[PDB]
Amino acid sequence: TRDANGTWEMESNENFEGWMKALDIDFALRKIAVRLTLTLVIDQDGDNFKTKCTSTFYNYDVDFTVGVEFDEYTKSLDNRHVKALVTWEGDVLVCVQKGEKENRGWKKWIEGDKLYLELTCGDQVCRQVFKKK
């Protein structure tokens, strides 16, 4: 269950607005984001990942190597500098983003053709589920 390769289509998205509000994204743009169809495209080779989230108005890409800290500028989101680090905790892929916000990061659970994603910031957790296309 350590294979996240694929195109992933959203099945559920809970507390999306609370998570976006914790990150301080504009109320008006949060309203638009909650209606957009989001597609997750992941390419994974060894320790190297390319992750792409696509919608009609907002796009987000990140590339990283498991175990190698990297500087991340969330130019597409809340426009903050964080020190990001992605690791394996068993079969869970864990990202911690050190910076202004506490408890910032995300976890992914690849159970066959289903991907569970939890985005955290502060006291907010957004839970998403995707199915491999």
Ligand X SMILES: *C/C=C/c1ccc2c(c1)C(C)(C)c1cc(N(CC)CC)ccc1-2
CB of 93 to ligand X, least distance (A): 7
Q: Taking a C-beta distance cutoff of 8 angstroms, is the pair 110, 1 a contact?
A: yes
Contact residues toward ligand X (CB under 6 A) are: 33, 36, 38, 40, 51, 53, 55, 58, 60, 76-77, 106, 108, 117, 119
| Residue among 101, 98, 99, 73 nearest 86 (CA) | 98
Tell me the sheet residues that pair with 120.
105, 125
CB of 57 to ligand X, least distance (A): 7
Comparing CB distances to ligand X, the nearer of 7 and 58 is 58
Comparing CB distances to ligand X, the nearer of 36 and 68 is 36
- Running DSSP on this structure, what letter comes out for residue 99? S
CB of 132 to ligand X, least distance (A): 14
Closest-approach residue to ligand X (CB): 33
Q: How far apart are the first and last CA of the chain?
A: 17
